[PDB]
UniProtKB/Swiss-Prot annotation:
Job of this protein: Scaffold subunit of various histone acetyltransferase (HAT) complexes, such as the MOZ/MORF and HBO1 complexes, that acts as a regulator of hematopoiesis. Plays a key role in HBO1 complex by directing KAT7/HBO1 specificity towards histone H3 'Lys-14' acetylation (H3K14ac), thereby promoting erythroid differentiation.
Free-text tissue specificity from the UniProt record: Highly expressed in testis.
Gene that specifies this protein: BRD1
Protein name, per record: Bromodomain-containing protein 1
Cross-link Glycyl lysine isopeptide (Lys-Gly) (interchain with G-Cter in SUMO2), sequence positions: 41
Organism this protein belongs to: Homo sapiens (Human)
Domain Bromo, first and last residues per copy: 9-113
Subunit structure: Component of some HBO1 complex composed of KAT7/HBO1, MEAF6, ING4 and BRD1/BRPF2. Component of the MOZ/MORF complex composed at least of ING5, KAT6A, KAT6B, MEAF6 and one of BRPF1, BRD1/BRPF2 and BRPF3. Interacts (via PHD-type zinc finger domain) with unmodified histone H3. Interacts (via PWWP domain) with dimethylated and trimethylated 'Lys-79' on histone H3.
Compartments, as annotated in UniProt: Nucleus; Chromosome
Length: 121
């Protein structure tokens, strides 16, 4: 149908905008602490602690399959990255601190993303 096509064009355009958001958030992680999944070879107990692991490469895979239907779904995954780190790692660690800085800096990016998503529809 033509409606299905229009819906698909909307999803494509959301994916475009979320790709730019993802790039901007990942720039706020210049140490690449959140770039890849926590290695279960190197942290073998991780899944005992963290039930839903997340990282930027995993988000990018979902994004490129057009697997985010709306900004809320995308934000859920970004918040997992931050929140998982702040639980597994203590306050005095470079990992926790990186997560705080990512959260604080990403907030600005996400605030305008939400306005754009609503504005363009």
């Amino acid at each position: 149908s033509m409606e299905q096509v229009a819906m698909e064009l909307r999803l494509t355009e959301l994916t475009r905008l979320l790709r730019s958001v993802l790039d901007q958030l990942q720039d706020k992680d210049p140490a690449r602490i959140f770039a890849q999944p926590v290695s279960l070879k190197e942290v073998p107990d991780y899944l005992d602690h963290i039930k839903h692991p997340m990282d930027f490469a995993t988000m990018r895979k979902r994004l490129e399959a057009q697997g985010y239907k709306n900004l809320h779904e995308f934000e859920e995954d970004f918040d997992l990255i931050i929140d998982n780190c702040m639980k597994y790692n203590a306050r005095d660690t470079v990992f926790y601190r990186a997560a705080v800085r990512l959260r604080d800096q990403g907030g600005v990016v996400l605030r305008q993303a939400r306005r754009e998503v609503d504005s363009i529809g």
